[PDB]
């Protein structure tokens, strides 16, 4: 049920998503080991993901959360990087996309920093890098991130290093 609609670079929607991507790059404490060395991206394509069933599953749950939190879903747009983005866009997020060893327990992780999610595109710690060149800093191979609508509701605040 998923269809992908290409956005034109002239579309203000393309432009605002590109800007979120570019303006949330930061330097990482690994010196680029996981995600590569870069200060910006070459954006090649932005597609809207349309799936009626997955959308209604999301809005159903959003309403439940909202009604448990004084009518506030506390909805954010956040990045997610994964080797499984093709499965996610077709079948939705589930237990199989959890970061079992993550610092906040086994759940599905999202970042405000695009460059943080970029570190997971080829796996935890960047895996072995791109399939073709085995390079975590590959400048040739095409990468994919998701920019996702996420319902946080009442969020537990963990101060952390």
């Amino acid at each position: 049920g998923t269809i992908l609609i290409d956005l034109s670079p002239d579309d203000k929607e393309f432009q605002s998503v590109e800007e979120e991507m570019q303006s949330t790059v930061r330097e990482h404490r690994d010196g680029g080991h996981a995600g590569g060395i870069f200060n910006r991206y070459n954006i090649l394509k932005i597609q809207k993901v349309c799936n009626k069933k997955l959308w209604e599953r999301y809005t159903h749950r959003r309403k439940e959360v909202s009604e448990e939190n004084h009518n506030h879903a506390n909805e954010r747009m956040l990045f997610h990087g994964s080797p499984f983005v093709n499965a996610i866009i077709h079948k939705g997020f589930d237990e199989r996309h959890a970061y079992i060893g993550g610092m906040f327990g086994a759940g599905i992780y999202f970042a405000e920093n695009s460059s943080k999610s970029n570190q997971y595109v080829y796996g935890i710690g960047g895996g072995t890098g791109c399939p073709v060149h085995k390079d975590r800093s590959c400048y040739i191979c095409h990468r994919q991130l998701l920019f996702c609508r996420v319902t946080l509701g009442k969020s537990f605040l963990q101060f952390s290093a």
Partner: peptide
């Protein structure tokens, strides 16, 4: 960074294809 524990609390709205730049 944020963590959710139910798949139904996120919808993958945009797929972005890119390269990192040297």
């Amino acid at each position: 960074e944020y963590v959710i524990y139910r798949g139904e609390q996120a919808y993958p709205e945009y797929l972005i294809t890119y390269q990192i730049m040297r």
